[PDB]
């Protein structure tokens, strides 16, 4: 069982960027710290995603999710009436509207889209670009 890398160095933070949609981009490392996965560095605008959908250059969109606290569920009498406990409410879409967009050429970017927006909703439906939700981490 080979022990993994253990290095250290001094690096200069990257210049902060403001693409309009999101701000930041001061991370000079190709991976993340607590996890071992690559961080994205290219972001999309509103019109960019809209046109990628209209022309078909986007294949599938994925949303993040939220826990949906139990008190806000109407599938049984409320907890406080004393009934047997219900398993769990299904999770909501992203309240803040983060999404990972997947292109026809293997590129994956990040964007912010509010769920239920007027134009994107109609474009998704007309062009059938795949939609899905990213499950929650343990």
């Amino acid at each position: 069982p080979a022990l993994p890398a253990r290095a250290t160095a001094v690096v200069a933070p990257l210049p902060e960027k403001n693409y309009g949609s999101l701000r930041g981009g001061r991370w000079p490392f190709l991976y993340d710290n607590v996890y071992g996965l690559p961080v994205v560095r290219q972001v999309a605008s509103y019109g960019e995603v809209l046109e990628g959908i209209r022309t078909g250059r986007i294949s599938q969109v994925l949303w993040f999710q939220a826990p949906r606290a139990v008190t806000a569920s109407a599938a049984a009498p409320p907890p406080g009436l004393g009934g047997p406990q219900q398993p769990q409410p299904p999770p909501l879409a992203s309240p803040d509207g983060r999404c990972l967009v997947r292109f026809a050429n293997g590129q994956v970017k990040q964007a912010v889209i509010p769920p239920g927006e007027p134009r994107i909703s109609q474009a998704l439906q007309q062009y059938g670009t795949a939609v899905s939700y990213i499950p929650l981490e343990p």
Binding site: G80, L81, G82
Partner: protein, 49 residues
Amino acid sequence: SIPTASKNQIALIRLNWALNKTNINTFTDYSKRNNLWTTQKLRNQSKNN
């Protein structure tokens, strides 16, 4: 899973609902539905008075 006063209140609520569910609430001495079928007996005993 829930405190005591809760379950006491819910027992009282169930008591009230159960008492309502017995379909006896409408019967009163002074209805007309009770005066129309009881005129025969009262007539009989009043003429036999």
